[PDB]
């Protein structure tokens, strides 16, 4: 015990250990599509994942992370609102107990069934731990998931989840291609924000794609069989591991598209 997503340790309690939870640039936020303004100076997003090297998948007790080798510029995000080069370190998801909830960002108050976060750190700061101390340290690519057709490129992830059911379990997860999780369009919204889990550091340029990917009910059902607890502990399904929308405060959300 420790922050989490339960009644006694969930998002409304995080500010006691992490006072930045009530900060000026917290995430996620609701994206009001009518208020977001098209910014013609935003540059196309460059997602360069052809040399991505996945290594491992880990249940960390709040989500599962697919981890990459970030010891060289293999998988990088550049362009869009970003200055410089950001290296992929891990992706993970947030999801609900029901299809009507699960995403962290919302779009005109709509909640999606889940949200994928591809986390990248700015190579100008040398390593992730230094990057999170900087206002432009991370770039997180957020992708909404809706339930409908299966996402073929997700299936290798869902099929390994039985081997990392409980907190602290990991499994080898090499040769996974994250290009198979992207939608067709790279149109996006962007704003300055934070990590959505403690320590809630205000170090993220968010890039949230407009186009959701579709996953099947069977795929998200397997997410919901994971556990927040460790092996041999009372079972607590890993569901509703999302932080709700936070006040936008003095921020503007920009759109890459008209
Ligand atoms: Zn996340």
Contact between 60 and 167 under an 8 Å Cβ cutoff? The reply is yes
For residue 72, give every residue at least 6 positions away whose Cβ sits within 8 Å of its Cβ, in sequence order, or none: none
Q: Token match 């997180």: residue?
A: 140
Experimental method: X-ray
Between CA 227 and CA 164 the distance in angstroms is 9
Sequence ranges of the domains in the chain: 1-258
Burial 183-203 (b: 16+ CB within 10 A, else e): eeebebbbbbbbbbbbebbbb
Active site residue: 8, 34, 62, 120, which one? Answer: 62
DSSP the chain: --S-SSTTTSGGGHHHH-GGGGSSS-S--EE-TTTSEE-TTPPPEEEE-TT--EEEEEE-SSSEEEEE--SSSSSEEEETT--S-EEEEEEEEEE-SSTT---SSEETTBPPSEEEEEEEEEGGGSSHHHHTTSTTSEEEEEEEEEESS--GGGHHHHHHGGGG-STT-EEE--S--GGGG--S---EEEEEE--SSTT--S-EEEEEESSPEEE-HHHHHHHTT-BSSPTTSPP-B-----PPP----S---EES--
Burial 233-258 (b: 16+ CB within 10 A, else e): eeebebbbbbbebbebeeeebbbbee
1-258 is classed in which CATH architecture? Roll (3.10)
Contact between 107 and 31 under an 8 Å Cβ cutoff? The reply is yes
Report CA torsion sign: 30, 244, 145, 60: positive
- Please state, in angstroms and as integers, the Cα–Cα distance from residue 105 to each residue in 136, 146, 217, following that order: 20, 13, 21
53 has binding-site annotation: no
Q: What is the resolution of this structure in A?
A: 1.0
The token pair at 45 is: 């997003």
Q: What distance in angstroms lies between residue 254's CA and the mean position of ligand 1's atoms?
A: 20
Q: What distance in angstroms lies between residue 257's CA and the mean position of ligand 1's atoms?
A: 24
196 has binding-site annotation: yes
Give residue 206's Cα distance to chain centre: 10
Between CA 195 and CA 132 the distance in angstroms is 9
Residues in the chain, total:
258
Q: What distance in angstroms lies between residue 41's CA and the mean position of ligand 1's atoms?
A: 27
197 has binding-site annotation: yes
Q: What distance in angstroms lies between residue 112's CA and the mean position of ligand 1's atoms?
A: 14
Between CA 208 and CA 116 the distance in angstroms is 10
117 has binding-site annotation: yes
Active site residue 105: no
């Amino acid at each position: 015990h420790h922050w989490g997503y339960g009644k006694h340790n969930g998002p409304e309690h995080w500010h006691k250990d992490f006072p930045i939870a009530k900060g000026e640039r917290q995430s996620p936020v609701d994206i009001d599509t009518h208020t977001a303004k098209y910014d013609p100076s935003l540059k196309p997003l460059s997602v360069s994942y052809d040399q991505a090297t996945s290594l491992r998948i880990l249940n960390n007790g709040h989500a599962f992370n697919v981890e990459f080798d970030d010891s060289q510029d293999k998988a990088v995000l550049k362009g869009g609102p970003l200055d410089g080069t950001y290296r992929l370190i891990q992706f993970h998801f947030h999801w609900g107990s029901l299809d009507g909830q699960g995403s962290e960002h919302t779009v005109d108050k709509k909640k999606y069934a889940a949200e994928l976060h591809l986390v990248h750190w700015n190579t100008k700061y040398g390593d992730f731990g230094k990057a999170v101390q900087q206002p432009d340290g991370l770039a997180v690519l957020g992708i909404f998931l809706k339930v409908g057709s299966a996402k073929p490129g997700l299936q290798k992830v869902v099929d390994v989840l039985d081997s990392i059911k409980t907190k602290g379990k990991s499994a080898d997860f090499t040769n996974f291609d994250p290009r198979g999780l992207l939608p067709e369009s790279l149109d996006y919204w962007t704003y300055p924000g934070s990590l959505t889990t403690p320590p809630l550091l205000e170090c993220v340029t968010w890039i949230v794609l407009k186009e959701p990917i579709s996953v099947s009910s069977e795929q998200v059902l397997k997410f919901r069989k994971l556990n927040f607890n460790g092996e041999g502990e009372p079972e607590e399904l890993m569901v509703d591991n999302w932080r709700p929308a936070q006040p936008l405060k003095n921020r503007q959300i920009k759109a890459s598209f008209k």
